Amino acid sequence: GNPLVYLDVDANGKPLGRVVLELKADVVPKTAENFRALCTGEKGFGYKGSTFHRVIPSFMCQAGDFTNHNGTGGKSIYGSRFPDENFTLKHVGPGVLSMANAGPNTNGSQFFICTIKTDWLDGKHVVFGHVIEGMDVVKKIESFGSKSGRTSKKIVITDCGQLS
Numbered sequence: 001g002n003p004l005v006y007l008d009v010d011a012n013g014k015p016l017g018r019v020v021l022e023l024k025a026d027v028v029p030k031t032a033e034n035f036r037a038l039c040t041g042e043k044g045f046g047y048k049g050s051t052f053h054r055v056i057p058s059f060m061c062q063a064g065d066f067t068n069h070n071g072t073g074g075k076s077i078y079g080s081r082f083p084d085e086n087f088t089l090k091h092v093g094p095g096v097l098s099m100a101n102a103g104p105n106t107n108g109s110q111f112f113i114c115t116i117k118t119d120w121l122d123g124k125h126v127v128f129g130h131v132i133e134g135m136d137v138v139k140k141i142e143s144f145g146s147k148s149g150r151t152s153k154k155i156v157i158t159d160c161g162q163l164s
């Protein structure tokens with residue numbers, strides 16, 4: 001019984017499409033629930049209106065800093081940060097959804113979608129889902145990144161929520 005959630009993403013105020021994500025509540029229920037609730041906005045804050053602020057081609061697209069919009073912020077539905085739940089799921093390839101962090105037990109709201117296998121992150125970042133559809137939209141986001149991570153257009157999650 002895993003949630004399906006979605007992100008609708010713009011680049012410079014024009015739609016790129018929808019990314020649909022499965023959240024692995026079966027393996028990482030606490031981490032999946034955080035992301036699910038941040039998509040619906042049901043706790044009074046979440047991803048709607050925030051940005052993909054760090055996008056690195058042939059690596060990943062990072063988002064979820066809805067407090068500072070720059071990679072230094074974000075917060076979970078539980079509090080500012082929560083522990084690493086487990087490292088059972090691995091960074092096996094493109095489309096993996098994983099938590100950004102600033103060291104052990106610092107999960108908040110920032111997350112990334114991989115565009116390659118990032119196996120050097122295994123055991124260090126908590127993987128909690130993957131792209132079901134809209135990988136083409138992720139590739140569009142990726143194309144507005146750079147090796148530095150800085151984006152050439154403002155990439156915004158205009159809407160997000162739960163499909164099932």
Ligand SMILES: CCN1Cc2cc3c(cc2NCCC1=O)OCO3
Pocket residue numbers: 071072073074075076080081100101102106107108109110
């Ligand atoms: C670690 C400081 N800080 C904000 C933060 C920044 C991050 C991150 C996770 C968090 N955690 C949420 C609350 C918190 O304590 O991963 C990438 O940059």
